[PDB]
Structure 1
Amino acid sequence: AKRNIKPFDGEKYAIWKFRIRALLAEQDVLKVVDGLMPNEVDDSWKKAERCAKSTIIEYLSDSFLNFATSDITARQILENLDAVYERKSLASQLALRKRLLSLKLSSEMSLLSHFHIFDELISELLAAGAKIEEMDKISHLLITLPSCYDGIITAIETLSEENLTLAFVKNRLLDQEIKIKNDH
């Protein structure tokens, strides 16, 4: 169907799963993976069962084709992929925290790009089962900033006391950014 779905090669599994779910819902097939099992099978509940399986097999890389083996239903294929990939794994959380602590701003990349990278990494870490509160997100973001971003954040903690949100600090940081570039 839609060719925008990159074949699943074991990376960014949540993105591939969301794309597959959206495409299945597009053809009125998503009900198979998350629905109610009828006590007896019907013709309507006979096509979507295998249509979803064929769709999943279509958008899978060659190595991962073993997840079906022509005997596992489409729901259970995704269930197995979930049990192997979207698992709350402590190793993934440690790796994500280690890489998060390594984020440093460089003059050769834009501030918005760094915001996007931070947001995606935070979302991935949240997917790893760990719980992060908004203030913890902000603190993780701030330690990445360089020394030039000193006065702005100090004013942030001193003045703001209740509007302390990731969106607000992002807005303040980006608004401050132009004053550095023209200053060099």
Structure 2
Amino acid sequence: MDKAKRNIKPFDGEKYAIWKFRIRALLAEQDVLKVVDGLMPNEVDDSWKKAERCAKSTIIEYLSDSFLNFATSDITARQILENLDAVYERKSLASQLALRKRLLSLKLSSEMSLLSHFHIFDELISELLAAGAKIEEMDKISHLLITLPSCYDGIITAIETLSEENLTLAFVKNRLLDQEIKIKNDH
């Protein structure tokens, strides 16, 4: 059976925890997830052996060569996950406040290169996926909006109305295009 290649890259970097959590789902349909989760049975069937082989192979496909050194030749998938967890794991503290302190540093930029500001919020989403997970686009759009110039101050808050009912952040970006449109049009 071919392993359907995913744009989830072979882990080498941030949150093996989330990456491996999504790998657990990838393991679950072959259910080699069950064998790595499962007690090493008194009866290791050929199915269990094949599942362990497959799991290690999946890990390899999903791990960078530097991490493949931890994989080594035949160390069980479970043992390698444990080693990686032990070395890697800082459990709780860093995750939200890394995003937060980055937002403190990465905010309040209303005028210079609004397209770089597109990239700014893109980095913010990246940081949310990476470390910050508490609240979603309503708060994001709120501070992004506050980040920016006067036109929203007039329109958004009342006049734009419950456009949040649609939550068309796409049209919000298009409103930034409209800012650009007006800027060129006035001259």
Return the TM-score normalized by structure 2: 0.58
Give CA-to-partner distance per residue, 1:97-141, whole Å, 9 cap, x none.
122234469899986875576356346436536422554233232
Stretches of structure 1 that go unaligned for 5 or more consecutive residues are none
1:155 equivalent in alignment to 2:158: yes
- SS of the residue 1:182 aligns to: helix
Aligned-residue offset at 1:47:
0.8
Larger helix proportion of the pair: 2
CA distance in 2, matches of 1:175, 1:96: 30
2:56 aligned partner: 53
CA distance in 1, matches of 2:182, 2:40: 60
Q: Which moved more, 1:27-36 or 1:48-57?
A: 27-36
Alignment CA distance shift 1:142-1:34 (3 Å): farther
Contact in 1 for aligned 2:11/2:64 (Cα 8 Å): yes
CA distance in 2, matches of 1:181, 1:15: 45
Alignment CA distance shift 1:120-1:174 (3 Å): same
Aligned residues: 184
Give CA-to-partner distance per residue, 1:19-41, whole Å, 9 cap, x none.
75576568664554456865521
Q: Which moved more, 1:137-146 or 1:114-123?
A: 114-123
Aligned-residue offset at 1:56:
1.6
Contact in 1 for aligned 2:110/2:148 (Cα 8 Å): no
CA distance in 1, matches of 2:114, 2:181: 10
Alignment CA distance shift 1:11-1:108 (3 Å): farther
Alignment CA distance shift 1:58-1:165 (3 Å): closer
Return the TM-score normalized by structure 1: 0.59
Contact in 2 for aligned 1:89/1:128 (Cα 8 Å): no
Of all paired residues, the percent bearing the same amino acid is 100
What is the alpha-carbon root mean square deviation over aligned residues? 4.9
Q: Which moved more, 1:97-106 or 1:170-179?
A: 170-179
Alignment CA distance shift 1:126-1:4 (3 Å): closer
CA distance in 1, matches of 2:155, 2:114: 15
